[PDB]
């Protein structure tokens, strides 16, 4: 039922799910969301890489916490965050995700979800585009590691995830950068930290979670770009 999967407490509310990849050509790859317990609702960030990883963490929250899961949003249109779409949609969960990712996702191989987020031009999300998020705060700090990332910040816990955005503080690189934009990848993640400017844990894609550290770490790597 849930056994593959990852779950760890990061606080009293919120746990990090974590999924591995199996696919030929590639090593056990770590893909990291969060699931969030707002008073008697849970949210979820990000899926896994599969429809029954995905539904893992469904039963992970039914055995574990036991109430009703009210959305989910994904952070960029990706297999790793959006490879179990189709499970939230078969819960008859409300999934949400950029404009822009909903656009790529057929691109990409996925399936969009079912709402599109839209976007302040000062970065925050237009709340009649994500009504009832609560705690969750999402922000869109501009193309970086790719077009479509955006980030979010758990009210009332000092912690945030970059998605993709943030590389690890001990990164050699940045990774792929094949959807990157090279000149607004400083800028981008810089407006993260600015963003959420209380928050000290950083939740990573695929490595463990990480400081403020990491933030500077990735935007003076993004400096060497440009």
């Given at each position: 039922?849930?056994?593959?999967?990852?779950?760890?407490?990061?606080?009293?509310?919120?746990?990090?799910?974590?999924?591995?990849?199996?696919?030929?050509?590639?090593?056990?790859?770590?893909?990291?969301?969060?699931?969030?317990?707002?008073?008697?609702?849970?949210?979820?960030v990000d899926?896994?890489?599969?429809?029954?990883?995905?539904?893992?963490?469904?039963?992970?929250?039914?055995?574990?916490?036991?109430?009703?899961?009210?959305?989910?949003?994904?952070?960029?249109?990706?297999?790793?965050?959006?490879?179990?779409?189709?499970?939230?949609?078969?819960?008859?969960?409300?999934?949400?995700?950029?404009?822009?990712?909903?656009?790529?996702?057929?691109?990409?191989?996925?399936?969009?979800?079912?709402?599109?987020?839209?976007?302040?031009?000062?970065?925050?999300?237009?709340?009649?585009?994500?009504?009832?998020?609560?705690?969750?705060?999402?922000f869109y700090?501009?193309?970086?590691?790719?077009?479509?990332?955006?980030?979010?910040?758990?009210?009332?816990?000092?912690?945030?995830?970059?998605?993709?955005?943030?590389?690890?503080?001990?990164?050699?690189?940045?990774?792929?950068?094949?959807?990157?934009?090279?000149?607004?990848?400083?800028?981008?993640?810089?407006?993260?930290?600015?963003?959420?400017?209380?928050?000290?844990?950083?939740?990573?894609?695929?490595?463990?979670?990480?400081?403020?550290?990491?933030?500077?770490?990735?935007?003076?790597?993004?400096?060497?770009?440009?």
């Amino acid at each position: 039922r849930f056994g593959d999967l990852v779950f760890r407490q990061l606080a009293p509310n919120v746990w990090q799910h974590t999924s591995y990849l199996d696919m030929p050509g590639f090593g056990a790859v770590a893909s990291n969301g969060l699931i969030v317990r707002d008073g008697g609702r849970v949210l979820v960030v990000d899926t896994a890489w599969t429809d029954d990883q995905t539904a893992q963490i469904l039963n992970w929250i039914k055995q574990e916490i036991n109430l009703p899961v009210a959305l989910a949003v994904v952070t960029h249109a990706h297999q790793d965050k959006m490879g179990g779409m189709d499970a939230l949609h078969a819960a008859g969960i409300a999934t949400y995700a950029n404009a822009l990712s909903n656009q790529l996702a057929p691109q990409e191989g996925m399936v969009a979800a079912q709402h599109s987020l839209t976007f302040a031009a000062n970065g925050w999300v237009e709340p009649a585009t994500a009504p009832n998020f609560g705690p969750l705060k999402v922000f869109y700090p501009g193309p970086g590691h790719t077009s479509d990332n955006i980030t979010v910040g758990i009210d009332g816990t000092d912690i945030a995830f970059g998605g993709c955005l943030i590389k690890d503080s001990k990164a050699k690189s940045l990774g792929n950068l094949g959807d990157a934009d090279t000149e607004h990848y400083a800028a981008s993640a810089r407006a993260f930290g600015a963003a959420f400017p209380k928050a000290s844990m950083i939740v990573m894609s695929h490595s463990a979670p990480d400081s403020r550290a990491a933030i500077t770490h990735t935007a003076r790597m993004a400096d060497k770009l440009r």
